[PDB]
Coordinates of C-alpha atoms and ligand atoms in Angstrom, one line a residue:
Chain F
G31 CA 21.0 -93.3 -85.4
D32 CA 24.4 -91.7 -84.8
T33 CA 25.8 -89.2 -87.3
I34 CA 29.2 -87.6 -88.0
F35 CA 28.2 -84.7 -85.9
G36 CA 27.8 -87.1 -82.9
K37 CA 31.3 -88.2 -83.5
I38 CA 32.5 -84.6 -83.5
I39 CA 30.6 -83.9 -80.2
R40 CA 32.2 -87.0 -78.7
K41 CA 35.7 -85.8 -79.9
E42 CA 36.1 -89.1 -81.8
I43 CA 37.1 -87.3 -85.1
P44 CA 38.8 -83.9 -85.4
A45 CA 37.1 -80.6 -86.0
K46 CA 38.2 -77.0 -85.7
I47 CA 36.2 -76.1 -82.6
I48 CA 35.3 -72.4 -82.2
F49 CA 33.3 -72.6 -79.0
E50 CA 31.8 -75.2 -76.7
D51 CA 29.5 -75.1 -73.6
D52 CA 27.4 -77.7 -71.7
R53 CA 24.7 -77.8 -74.4
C54 CA 26.2 -76.9 -77.8
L55 CA 29.3 -76.9 -80.0
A56 CA 30.4 -74.5 -82.7
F57 CA 33.0 -75.6 -85.3
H58 CA 34.1 -74.6 -88.8
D59 CA 32.4 -76.4 -91.6
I60 CA 34.6 -78.9 -93.5
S61 CA 33.1 -77.8 -96.9
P62 CA 33.0 -74.0 -96.5
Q63 CA 30.8 -72.0 -98.8
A64 CA 32.1 -68.5 -97.7
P65 CA 35.4 -67.2 -96.3
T66 CA 33.8 -67.9 -92.9
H67 CA 31.4 -70.8 -92.6
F68 CA 30.8 -72.5 -89.3
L69 CA 28.1 -74.6 -87.6
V70 CA 26.4 -74.4 -84.2
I71 CA 24.9 -77.7 -83.1
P72 CA 23.1 -78.8 -79.9
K73 CA 24.6 -81.7 -78.0
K74 CA 21.1 -83.1 -77.7
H75 CA 20.4 -85.3 -80.8
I76 CA 17.5 -83.6 -82.4
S77 CA 17.5 -85.1 -85.9
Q78 CA 15.8 -82.2 -87.7
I79 CA 14.0 -79.0 -86.9
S80 CA 10.7 -80.4 -87.9
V81 CA 10.8 -82.8 -84.8
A82 CA 11.9 -80.2 -82.3
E83 CA 9.6 -79.8 -79.3
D84 CA 8.2 -76.7 -77.6
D85 CA 10.6 -77.3 -74.7
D86 CA 13.5 -76.9 -77.1
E87 CA 12.8 -73.2 -77.7
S88 CA 15.5 -72.0 -75.3
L89 CA 18.1 -74.4 -76.7
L90 CA 17.3 -73.4 -80.4
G91 CA 17.6 -69.7 -79.5
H92 CA 20.8 -70.5 -77.7
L93 CA 22.3 -71.8 -81.0
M94 CA 21.5 -68.5 -82.6
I95 CA 22.9 -66.4 -79.7
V96 CA 26.1 -68.5 -79.7
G97 CA 26.2 -68.2 -83.4
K98 CA 26.0 -64.4 -83.4
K99 CA 28.6 -64.2 -80.6
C100 CA 31.0 -66.4 -82.6
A101 CA 30.4 -64.4 -85.7
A102 CA 31.4 -61.2 -83.9
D103 CA 34.5 -63.0 -82.4
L104 CA 35.4 -64.1 -85.9
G105 CA 35.3 -60.5 -87.2
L106 CA 32.1 -60.7 -89.3
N107 CA 31.4 -57.0 -88.7
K108 CA 29.8 -56.5 -92.2
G109 CA 27.1 -59.2 -91.6
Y110 CA 26.4 -62.8 -92.2
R111 CA 23.6 -65.3 -92.9
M112 CA 22.3 -68.1 -90.6
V113 CA 20.6 -71.1 -92.2
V114 CA 18.8 -74.2 -91.0
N115 CA 17.9 -76.8 -93.6
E116 CA 15.1 -79.3 -93.2
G117 CA 14.6 -82.4 -95.3
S118 CA 15.2 -83.1 -99.0
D119 CA 13.9 -79.8 -100.4
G120 CA 15.8 -77.9 -97.7
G121 CA 19.0 -79.7 -98.7
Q122 CA 19.7 -81.0 -95.2
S123 CA 22.9 -82.9 -95.3
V124 CA 23.3 -84.4 -91.7
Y125 CA 20.3 -85.5 -89.7
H126 CA 21.4 -83.7 -86.5
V127 CA 20.0 -80.2 -86.2
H128 CA 22.7 -77.6 -87.2
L129 CA 22.8 -73.8 -87.7
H130 CA 25.0 -72.7 -90.6
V131 CA 26.6 -69.3 -90.2
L132 CA 28.2 -67.8 -93.3
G133 CA 30.0 -64.6 -93.9
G134 CA 33.1 -62.8 -95.2
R135 CA 31.5 -62.2 -98.6
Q136 CA 28.3 -60.8 -100.0
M137 CA 25.5 -63.4 -99.6
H138 CA 23.1 -63.3 -102.4
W139 CA 19.3 -63.5 -103.0
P140 CA 17.6 -65.9 -103.3
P141 CA 19.3 -67.9 -100.6
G142 CA 19.6 -71.0 -102.8
Chain Z
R121 CA 4.7 -47.4 -81.0
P122 CA 5.0 -51.1 -80.0
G123 CA 7.0 -53.0 -82.6
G124 CA 8.6 -49.8 -84.2
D125 CA 8.0 -48.2 -87.5
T126 CA 9.7 -50.5 -90.0
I127 CA 7.3 -52.1 -92.4
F128 CA 7.2 -55.1 -90.0
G129 CA 6.2 -52.9 -87.0
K130 CA 3.4 -51.5 -89.2
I131 CA 2.3 -55.0 -90.1
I132 CA 2.4 -56.1 -86.4
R133 CA 0.0 -53.2 -85.6
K134 CA -2.3 -54.0 -88.5
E135 CA -1.5 -50.6 -90.1
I136 CA -0.3 -52.2 -93.3
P137 CA -2.0 -55.3 -94.6
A138 CA -0.4 -58.7 -94.8
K139 CA -1.4 -62.3 -95.4
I140 CA -1.1 -63.7 -91.9
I141 CA -0.5 -67.4 -91.2
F142 CA -0.2 -67.5 -87.4
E143 CA -0.2 -65.0 -84.6
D144 CA 0.5 -65.2 -80.9
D145 CA 1.6 -62.9 -78.1
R146 CA 5.3 -63.2 -79.1
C147 CA 5.4 -63.4 -82.9
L148 CA 3.6 -63.2 -86.2
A149 CA 4.0 -65.4 -89.3
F150 CA 3.0 -63.9 -92.7
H151 CA 3.8 -64.4 -96.4
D152 CA 6.6 -62.6 -98.1
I153 CA 5.5 -60.0 -100.7
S154 CA 8.4 -61.0 -103.0
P155 CA 8.5 -64.8 -102.7
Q156 CA 11.7 -66.6 -103.7
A157 CA 10.1 -70.0 -103.5
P158 CA 6.6 -71.4 -104.1
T159 CA 6.1 -71.0 -100.4
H160 CA 8.0 -68.2 -98.7
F161 CA 6.9 -66.7 -95.4
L162 CA 8.4 -64.7 -92.5
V163 CA 8.3 -65.2 -88.7
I164 CA 8.9 -62.1 -86.7
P165 CA 8.9 -61.2 -83.0
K166 CA 6.4 -58.6 -81.9
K167 CA 9.2 -57.2 -79.7
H168 CA 11.3 -54.9 -81.9
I169 CA 14.9 -56.1 -82.2
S170 CA 16.7 -54.5 -85.1
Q171 CA 19.0 -57.4 -86.0
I172 CA 20.3 -60.7 -84.6
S173 CA 23.7 -59.1 -83.9
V174 CA 22.2 -57.0 -81.1
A175 CA 19.8 -59.6 -79.6
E176 CA 20.2 -60.0 -75.9
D177 CA 21.0 -63.2 -74.0
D178 CA 17.5 -63.2 -72.6
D179 CA 16.0 -63.2 -76.1
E180 CA 17.0 -66.9 -76.5
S181 CA 13.5 -68.3 -75.9
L182 CA 11.9 -65.8 -78.2
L183 CA 14.3 -66.5 -81.0
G184 CA 13.8 -70.3 -80.6
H185 CA 10.1 -69.6 -80.6
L186 CA 10.4 -68.1 -84.1
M187 CA 11.9 -71.4 -85.3
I188 CA 9.3 -73.6 -83.6
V189 CA 6.5 -71.4 -85.0
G190 CA 8.3 -71.5 -88.4
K191 CA 8.4 -75.3 -88.4
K192 CA 4.8 -75.6 -87.3
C193 CA 3.6 -73.2 -90.0
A194 CA 5.6 -75.1 -92.6
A195 CA 3.8 -78.4 -91.6
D196 CA 0.4 -76.7 -91.6
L197 CA 1.2 -75.4 -95.1
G198 CA 2.0 -78.9 -96.4
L199 CA 5.8 -78.5 -96.9
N200 CA 6.2 -82.2 -96.3
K201 CA 9.4 -82.4 -98.5
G202 CA 11.2 -79.8 -96.3
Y203 CA 12.2 -76.2 -96.3
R204 CA 15.0 -73.7 -95.5
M205 CA 15.1 -71.2 -92.7
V206 CA 17.2 -68.1 -93.1
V207 CA 18.2 -65.2 -90.9
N208 CA 20.0 -62.3 -92.6
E209 CA 22.3 -60.0 -90.7
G210 CA 23.5 -56.7 -92.0
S211 CA 24.9 -55.8 -95.4
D212 CA 26.8 -59.0 -96.3
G213 CA 23.8 -61.0 -95.0
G214 CA 21.4 -59.2 -97.3
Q215 CA 19.3 -57.7 -94.6
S216 CA 16.9 -55.0 -96.0
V217 CA 14.5 -54.6 -93.0
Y218 CA 16.0 -53.9 -89.6
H219 CA 13.5 -55.9 -87.5
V220 CA 14.6 -59.4 -86.8
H221 CA 12.9 -62.0 -89.0
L222 CA 13.2 -65.7 -90.0
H223 CA 12.6 -66.6 -93.6
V224 CA 11.0 -70.0 -94.3
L225 CA 11.2 -71.1 -98.0
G226 CA 9.9 -74.3 -99.5
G227 CA 7.9 -76.0 -102.2
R228 CA 10.9 -76.4 -104.5
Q229 CA 14.4 -77.9 -104.2
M230 CA 16.6 -75.4 -102.5
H231 CA 20.2 -75.1 -103.8
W232 CA 23.6 -74.9 -102.2
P233 CA 25.3 -72.6 -101.4
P234 CA 22.4 -70.6 -99.8
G235 CA 23.3 -67.5 -101.7
Ligands
KB7_492 C1 16.1 -59.5 -99.1 C2 16.2 -60.4 -97.8 N1 16.6 -59.7 -96.6 C3 15.6 -59.1 -95.9 O1 15.8 -58.3 -95.0 O2 14.3 -59.6 -96.1 C4 13.2 -58.9 -95.7 C5 11.9 -59.4 -96.4 O3 10.8 -58.6 -96.1 C6 9.9 -58.7 -97.2 N2 9.0 -57.5 -97.2 C7 9.4 -56.3 -97.3 N3 8.3 -55.4 -97.3 C8 7.3 -56.2 -97.1 C9 5.8 -56.0 -97.0 O4 5.3 -54.9 -97.0 N4 5.0 -57.1 -96.8 C10 5.5 -58.4 -96.8 N5 4.7 -59.4 -96.6 N6 6.8 -58.6 -96.9 C11 7.7 -57.6 -97.0 C12 10.8 -58.7 -98.4 O5 10.2 -59.2 -99.6 C13 12.1 -59.5 -98.0 O6 12.0 -60.8 -98.4
CL493 CL1 22.4 -78.9 -94.0

């Protein structure tokens, strides 16, 4: 099934895009939990990390490399936190794999 | 020494004990000594990378491998209701060990924001 992130990838609804390539998209989160809070998502519709395949390893690592590069470009020189949520206990909100990147404030422990 | 001399490098080389869940040629999964959830483990590369901000472009497959191993271990540990994966970078990220690592937490409802 389609999700709102599919609509964002397809440019059907607006989002504040930070970076795009042939295989992923980074954009600011509409409900930010830190002064900087963006998402990096694959264009391939993987519904959740628990169903990713071995062949997806490069793509998943690409989300993290893009995420760390965007974080540097956004001036997060004091650090940041990356989060992937899975399922109900993980608090996953959209069933399209997404990497949260949060910074601009002290992130606390435990991480939720 | 291969893996460096952070606590995680020592664990990689079996010089400090740990409760190991999974091991392959690229990574190691082991339980966190100060768990923040009923299940809380770490997946780390055997290659020493100090922090995600300095990872190289050719580290992509290895970083993704941490997540695939993390999700496989979570399933093998019975985290059928889900889990949260976390990478901490630097001071604002709460990083305390400068060897790249993926936290996996579950067995309870995780809250938002994630710290
Ligand atoms: C605070 C989160 N930011 C961070 O950088 O997390 C690093 C994580 O490494 C864990 N840890 C430290 N020493 C040891 C050790 O000897 N053994 C084990 N099995 N885990 C350890 C620590 O509890 C923390 O959650
Ligand atoms: Cl989520």
